[PDB]
Design a protein around this ligand. Structure first.
Ligand SMILES: Nc1ncnc2c1ncn2[C@@H]1O[C@H](COP(=O)(O)OP(=O)(O)O)[C@@H](O)[C@H]1O
Ligand SMILES: [Cl-]
Ligand SMILES: [Cl-]
Ligand SMILES: [K+]
Ligand SMILES: [Mg+2]
Length: 378
């Protein structure tokens, strides 16, 4: 085509294309290499990606995200019923299937999870098209290893609706291993551990690879642990700080909280490269600016338990795979959160100093591998 590889993420999506033996992780119209898996509806327009997430704080009811948590599931599914209680948007039941309901151009409308995700894939498709200067048709789209047939089918349908011919649906951990060339035959079988920590979910997958054939040995994790949870710890920290300094609680002002959450997410990323970060918010509450800062140490302490807890699923995955730490040949980092120095330290210490595969941006590794496989299938 060339064909492309797309990581349809829980919170961010990424598209890459393999040309001249190299993978190109494609930047969007705003120059970002990953795009929010968001879609918004207003009185006049449908927004997608950066444009949608950039207005989430002011239009919470009609800004959709987490469609991946609904995709391929039934309305009465326990997880679906549990998640709805936390989303600002409506999820309704249509013949037993979940649909998000929103207001668009003054009218009420509902979309299936695959329709919402097709909008995200369309955005990724156009992003690739703007870079290639050519129409993009074929693509490989990834999914978590634990996805069932219905979830895989619905993800594929999201692609078809986007005008893409889905060459294949492959597992995210497998895509990651392919990015590092771990799929090449080298004689005996090799055990690869994929440590994936994104913005909303945590997954540990152990794969055994032999003759280019992957075998998911075990999967562990927490579908409700991700970078967004680390931002929450920071948010509460600063809400307390603002109350101390100004004797005012901003907790009930949904927008002040989102602007603070956005500032924390940005500071967090900085703390992965530097030891301190400055928070500066103009007019956060009742015209009061919030200028402060936070140290990496402070950040690590606010999340110490959450970070350390990532090691339990690692132990359990090993146990279920019937392998000992020492039998793992490669450890691959996936997800933007794995860029956090403390998490790398924890994982490495657990593996007694073993080096981590982390040269490819973790939040891009899945798209990277998908792009490689998409080319191979073309
Ligand atoms: N440099 C960084 N340091 C810490 N966290 C990061 C960094 N870059 C991205 N992240 C985080 O990774 C998370 C999710 O991004 P990925 O790109 O992993 O998305 P998804 O949630 O769909 O897997 C977010 O919480 C984001 O804040
Ligand atoms: Cl864009
Ligand atoms: Cl430590
Ligand atoms: K992603
Ligand atoms: Mg991910």
């Amino acid at each position: 085509g060339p064909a492309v590889g797309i990581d349809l993420g829980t919170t961010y999506s990424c598209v890459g294309v393999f040309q001249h033996g190299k993978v190109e992780i494609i930047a969007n119209d705003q120059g970002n290499r990953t795009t929010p898996s968001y879609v918004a509806f207003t009185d006049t327009e449908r927004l997608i990606g950066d444009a949608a997430k950039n207005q989430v704080a002011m239009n919470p009811t009609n800004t959709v995200f987490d469609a991946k948590r609904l995709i391929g599931r039934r309305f009465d599914d326990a997880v679906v019923q549990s998640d709805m209680k936390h989303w600002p948007f409506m999820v309704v039941n249509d013949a037993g299937a979940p649909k998000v309901q929103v207001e668009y151009k003054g009218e009420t409308k509902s979309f299936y999870p695959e329709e919402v995700s097709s909008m995200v894939l369309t955005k990724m498709k156009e992003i690739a098209e703007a870079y290639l200067g050519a129409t993009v048709t074929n693509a490989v789209v990834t999914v978590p290893a634990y996805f069932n047939d219905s979830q895989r089918q619905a993800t594929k349908d999201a692609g078809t609706i986007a005008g893409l011919n889905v060459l294949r649906i492959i597992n995210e951990p497998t895509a990651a291993a392919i990015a590092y060339g771990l799929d090449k035959a080298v004689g005996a079988e090799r055990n690869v551990l994929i440590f994936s920590l994104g913005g909303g979910t945590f997954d540990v997958s152990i794969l055994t690879i032999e003759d280019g054939i992957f075998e998911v040995k075990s999967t562990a994790g927490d579908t409700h642990l991700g970078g967004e949870d680390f931002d929450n710890r920071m948010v509460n920290h600063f809400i307390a700080e603002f109350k101390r300094a100004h004797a005012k609680d901003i907790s009930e002002n949904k927008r002040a909280v989102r602007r603070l959450r956005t500032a924390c997410e940005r500071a967090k990323r900085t703390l992965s490269s530097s030891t301190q970060a400055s928070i500066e918010i103009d007019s956060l509450y009742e015209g009061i600016d919030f200028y402060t800062s936070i140290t990496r140490a402070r950040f690590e302490e606010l999340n110490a338990d959450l970070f350390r807890g990532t090691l339990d699923p690692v132990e359990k995955a090993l146990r279920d795979a019937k392998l000992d730490k020492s039998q793992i040949h490669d450890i691959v980092l996936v997800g933007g959160s794995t860029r956090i120095p403390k998490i790398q330290k924890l994982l490495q210490d657990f593996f007694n100093g073993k080096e981590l595969n982390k040269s490819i941006n973790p939040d891009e590794a899945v798209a990277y591998g998908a792009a490689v496989q998409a080319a191979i299938l073309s």
